[PDB]
Amino acid sequence: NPLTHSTPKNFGIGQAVQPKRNLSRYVKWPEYVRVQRQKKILSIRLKVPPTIAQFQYTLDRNTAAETFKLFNKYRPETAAEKKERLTKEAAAVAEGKSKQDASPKPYAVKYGLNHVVALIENKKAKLVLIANDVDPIELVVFLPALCKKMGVPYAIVKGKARLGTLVNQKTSAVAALTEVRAEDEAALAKLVSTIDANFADKYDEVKKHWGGGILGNKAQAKMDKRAKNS
């Protein structure tokens, strides 16, 4: 084409006003964006104790998917299912003449912090899931130690939202299985065996290890430069 030519612009210094580049690294973000970014920066710059940072070791993706596959079989009743079984019980009370033999025994996950803590204390919990992302952390930070103390198996698992979805909440912060049906006892035993290997059997060694201390990108670069050069 003899009508089109090659201009190329000289985007150096002092020539050819600069093109639109991705300036997302340099955006003056809102103050809440900066606070929530520098907060997760500051929580890993400082030397975290071993009571926090026994969190951020989380149940990994395959065994968390297995854990939620088991725990979704024991979802609690929705409001619609509660209304259906309450109508079924009101039928058997009014005309069926059956006392408490209308609905069968429920198998469901246990949830709520006080309820789950009391189940751990009374040694009824067969498996406890602890959300890694609660705020304040003081609500669950005693729970690995309490679960190790009463011998129930715990798993610090990723997502208070994910734990809330299986209990039909927005956020659950713990979940617990206290009893399963007969067909899930082998699945629960396999899960407890692969969860205890990461959480309860590593507790006494994680209890001595401080987390954090992580330098930034630039500071780590200029620290391994000095380490290499000395």
Partner: protein, 247 residues
Amino acid sequence: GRVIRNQRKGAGSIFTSHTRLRQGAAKLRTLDYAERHGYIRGIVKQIVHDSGRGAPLAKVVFRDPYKYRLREEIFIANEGVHTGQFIYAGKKASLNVGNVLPLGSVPEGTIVSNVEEKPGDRGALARASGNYVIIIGHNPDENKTRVRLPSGAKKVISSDARGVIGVIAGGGRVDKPLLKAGRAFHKYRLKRNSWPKTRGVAMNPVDHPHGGGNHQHIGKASTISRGAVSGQKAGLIAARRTGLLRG
């Protein structure tokens, strides 16, 4: 018993500057990628007179690197710059009078002006007329530069602080006698209300520490402590010596 005249200057009622006619804050160009990595060419379009300042100001127009427009900066004109002169500002600038380049990238004995104290505060040192800063040192292991200021003070600045080559224009201004209170009146009329100065010995004792008495004398010593308080410091504050500078 009365608040005295040097104490009254901090409230800043009538003692503010008279800044109607001033061209703007005479500052260096802001430290950007062009000035930090290469150079940028601006053009002197006017050498104007600043009011209340003894030195002229060079209105130097640069091109904005990121938006198509023109960014006009107000430099203090070094002595020798002219209209239509290309002013090259940055690290890779050449050693010509008027260029704005860092103190690390100049030789020893270079004479700069409008030179910074910290890299990027846009001109702090040697800005009055005829004044200059001599570059007497470099310390590349700590990125410093030893300079000699107009007062004789040796100062250590960063080597990334900038300065404009040359002496500030308008030199030799104080060598002419003002000859009259009219010329002093019109001098201070565009600076600030620091004139005329009544002597404190002419005052009453309520107006000044020096005031009062049947004879105009000072009474106590004029040399006042540095740790003295506001209201006592009317004399020679924290004087190391007094009398004529002879040995």
